[PDB]
Design a protein around this nucleic acid. Sequence first.
RNA 1: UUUAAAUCCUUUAACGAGGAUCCAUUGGAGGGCAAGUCUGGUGCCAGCAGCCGCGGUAGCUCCAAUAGCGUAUAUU
Lengths: 51, 123, 237, 49, 49, 104, 53, 230, 171
Amino acid sequence: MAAAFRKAAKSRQREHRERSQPGFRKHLGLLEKKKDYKLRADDYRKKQEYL
Amino acid sequence: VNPKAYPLADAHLTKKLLDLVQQSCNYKQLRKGANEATKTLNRGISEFIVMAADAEPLEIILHLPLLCEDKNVPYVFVRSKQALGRACGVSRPVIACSVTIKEGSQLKQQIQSIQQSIERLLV
Amino acid sequence: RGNQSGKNVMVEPHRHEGVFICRGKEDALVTKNLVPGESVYGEKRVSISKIEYRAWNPFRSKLAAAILGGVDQIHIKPGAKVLYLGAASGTTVSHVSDIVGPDGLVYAVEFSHRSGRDLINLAKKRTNIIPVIEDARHPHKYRMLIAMVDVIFADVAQPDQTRIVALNAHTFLRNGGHFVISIKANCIDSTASAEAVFASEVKKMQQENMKPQEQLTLEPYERDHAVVVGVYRPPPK
Amino acid sequence: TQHKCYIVATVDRDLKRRIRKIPGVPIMYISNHRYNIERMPDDYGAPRF
Amino acid sequence: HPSCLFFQYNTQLGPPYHILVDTNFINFSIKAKLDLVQSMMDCLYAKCI
Amino acid sequence: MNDTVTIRTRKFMTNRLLQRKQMVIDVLHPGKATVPKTEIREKLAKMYKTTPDVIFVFGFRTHFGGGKTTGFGMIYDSLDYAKKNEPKHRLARHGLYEKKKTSR
Amino acid sequence: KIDRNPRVKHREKFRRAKIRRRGQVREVRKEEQRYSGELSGIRAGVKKSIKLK
Amino acid sequence: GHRDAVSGLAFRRGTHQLYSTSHDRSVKVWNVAENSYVETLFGHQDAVAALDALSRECCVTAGGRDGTVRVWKIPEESQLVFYGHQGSIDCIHLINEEHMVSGADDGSVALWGLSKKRPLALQREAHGLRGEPGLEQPFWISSVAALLNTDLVATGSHSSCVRLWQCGEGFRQLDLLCDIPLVGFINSLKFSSSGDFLVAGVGQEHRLGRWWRIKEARNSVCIIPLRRVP
Amino acid sequence: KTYVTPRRPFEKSRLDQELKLIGEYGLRNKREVWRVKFTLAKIRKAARELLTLDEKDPRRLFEGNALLRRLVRIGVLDEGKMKLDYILGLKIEDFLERRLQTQVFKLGLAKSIHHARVLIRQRHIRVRKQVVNIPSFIVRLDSQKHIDFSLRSPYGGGRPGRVKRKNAKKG
RNA sequence: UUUAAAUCCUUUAACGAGGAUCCAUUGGAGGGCAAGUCUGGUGCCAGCAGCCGCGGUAGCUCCAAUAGCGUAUAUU
Ligand SMILES: [Mg+2]
């Protein structure tokens, strides 16, 4: 009954929420997370490989 | 008898027909009148046509056979419009009736037999 | 809605020869009118700029239902002789007459005297239709009127369809000719299943030295119907 | 393939694996000293195992 | 797609069953001394041709 | 439109060995509940021109559906014969007889 | 809430089963109005007949 | 309480108990003295045409197109079905406690005993035939009547004559006595208590519909006297 | 018992058959199909066993006559089809049309199959004098003309229901 | 009403539904996540997993059976 144990645990579907930029640094821009930096990181790697 | 009323039913087959008409009216599967019989032929929703040969001008119903031969629809005549009047549950003489297609109707077995009997009249 | 009268519309040829497509907001199947300005059963016709086309109704016709269903071959082409069994009033016959054109001929067979009077009125206006008011079960009775033909179209709707076609095919159909037969499952055998009926009729056809080639159903327009296309006495390849 | 109205009766293994790829066709085969049907809903009096 | 099939269910297969017999099915039927028509009727409780 | 409770008599016979008349009673009451035995006694007494004290009825069973009820009834010649022949519990149902506890 | 009653669960499964069938095969309809066109295109390139051999 | 047209009414003779039937295939019992409803009876398969009663706690019904005539033993809770002549049964009347007469739209007249499932006597084409050559059909019988405790039976149709009948020994035969000339649809026939005269209801149309309209007829009630010498 | 679980628990064809049946006749679960299939299997096995006997055997004559009378009176067969072959021809849809639910749907007293089941389960349908609330009731041939609304029902001219009375008291 | 008395069965008056929350289960297979923890590498990766995070404490989807549904041992 391994799946039965899994179904009970996943009864609650509230997922962890994201934190925002602090107010006193609002004019700088959005606080980047791993999902955002990965877009900027893969962009650099493609150009350097091409050169 | 006027020869234009060729499919004329006998005594025994008339009893089966008028019983089936009375059954069909209860199941809301019957269209009464010359004009209403014509409309079902256009829509292709008729099993057969029952007409009254005792109309004083026989010509007013002779347009129905022409439509039947194109749709391959059997048709018969009966000797009385007044006998046709009661079986349809109407208080007036009726010269033409049409029984409608109904999906899943329990009258299919009885209708299937009566169509075969009509075709036997044409030999 | 539909194709209202007074709408701009395009006519382009179909894959089959002699058949046309009426391209517009909705598409209809049309054939070129042999006698301009006349409607035989009230269909909607289109004027093209001296030239006119007539719409083909697939609910009232068994050949048009097959064409819309995607049949591979119909073998009715301009300049061909076509023998039609079971002409009835002439709704389908008129469209067949349009395809064959002035050169081809249509032999219309209809036993009933009531519907026979409509063919003669229709044959008056169309010079390439030969009315034959005779029983199709006895081809020897009208062997005077009919020469060799190329295509036999059968819509007789009888329990003995195969035998009727077999007699006429031997007497009149030329070698290498083709045949189109419409099968109504409820007519041959109501007791047996519709699918087993289609297998039995094909079996009888092969016993009559006829080679069936294709079949398809006409489901969106008709229930328990099939159309079988084949060749008679094929030439060696 | 053409007609879809037949029931195939055979005992060869190789033919049976081809017919299983065609949808909607039963297969009849001999099991023990009795006849058996494979892909038919209305089997009724079939060997129960 | 044929109209007889409702997904994988064959509707037009009917109580008169048409059965195509393979050449090997005949031989094993005699070896087990099973009557060809009679055993099919016992399996399906219906007319078989 | 008013609904009424109707009484019908069947298998009526006169038993002279016990001085009574016995019958089967059919009660028709289409809409109401089962009629109490006292009202049946009053109606039957009016029907047979006797006082209610000599009518004893029992065994009323209502058919499924609520239409009709079937029971049994007996009418005696006089009150003394009724007290003399009836079983004790039916008399106690009318209050004529009282059961007495016995010490063991 | 659908899983609470098995009968209405089977009712809903049939309604989908008819919809999913509509892709494979065409449903029969009568000529309830005068024929006014196909309401879609007419494709002349598809050959959907079954070859017999 | 009835759900369709009421086509039958008859009192129990000597009482105030009223029996009614309707096109809704049900038979109901009422107490006119107590203005109360008693019970409902079932078993018919089509609209009922007429209902007749007598001294006994029983009633008889005409089944119309159902083709049956039924005897209702109410207190015994028993039902009898009689299959007789072909066609719809449109009228019924009792002769005595053990005999009745019924009429049909096929022209037949049937004599029934309440103890036998088939008619004792059956007279076909009681009012003759009509129609064009090749389309001849019997006259429709509209009403029948009988004088209590005798063999006298009267039938009426649109054959322009009212026919008097006598029942044979054992009610095994019906013989025509005389024809009373009267033009129109004889919708109702009622004998007198003394039996000295007959009252007939004549109308231009049949009582149920407008299938025919007779112009020469008059909408009137006719008293036909019966005069006897031995 | 009255049913047997299927020999093969995983067949696409069998699942599609059961799905089509339940969808068309508004059944509750698979048991309502399997019971009918069990009864039909019993009847057809009996018919085949009688069919294996000689024609002139008295036992075959008696048992076949009894079986044919029963099948005709329950309405599955036809009066002119009194042969064993037509017994072998029977399907399960023939038995499914004879339920009270399907009949009360077909005579128009209800306007849907699930509406028919709801009407039956709430004591709205009568057969002759008796009130029947069992959806799987098999209607005999004679009783088919005696299905109607019950006299005490709101639809049969009886007293109006709870909601009507409460709204009338409201206004 | 029933019965020695009473219960039960059958009649029957009055209340009793919008998220109709007056809330069906058991087994199988998937998706979704942080300034969170651990382990190993091939910079930004992968596995395992995740009600635990900086501060704060006032009810996702699909499949099979359905008032029923699994697991373990032996076995045919
Ligand atoms: Mg609401």
